[PDB]
Copies of this chain bind each other. A is one copy, B any other.
Amino acid sequence: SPGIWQLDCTHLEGKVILVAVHVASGYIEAEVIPAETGQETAYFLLKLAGRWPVKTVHTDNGSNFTSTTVKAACWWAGIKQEDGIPYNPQSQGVIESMNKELKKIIGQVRDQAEHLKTAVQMAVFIHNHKRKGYSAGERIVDIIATDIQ
């Protein structure tokens, strides 16, 4: 559980926002890309796994699950690649809710940035710092620190 992440791909302004959510905390990292490809997904996962202890990734769709480039990145980084089938059905809804909420925040900051990528990183910041009490950033650190100990 400390090591479980979920990929999520959402669309805005004709572009793609690729998101990794740390399932137990709600903490996210995100990037804007022109389109979701295996190469983009592979690179994003490499970045993520260098920054946090990523043990398992629930991939967002079958194309990324199948991608030989994504499989290579997961092998390289020591990530177990799993499907993202919401056997637990409240998973879909939790992600749909996060996407709506991310887009809401993006809209709230959108006029402060010339470029979408900047607004997305502003939204990541706001999301990870928001107290709900702990923030997602606080929860992920506590979860992993408990695991190490």
Contact = CB atoms under 8 A, between A and B. Distances in A.
A144 interface: yes
A46 B145 contact: no
A51 B76 contact: no
Nearest to A112: B76
Interface stretch (A11-19, A57-65, A89-97, A118-126): A118-126
Residue from A50, A51, A124 having most chain B Cβ neighbours under 10 A = A50
Contacts of A76: 112, 122
Interface range, A side:
20 to 34
Given A76-B122, A142-B145, A148-B138, A128 B51 contact: yes
Contacts of A46: 118, 121-122, 125
Interface string A30-48: 0000000000000100110
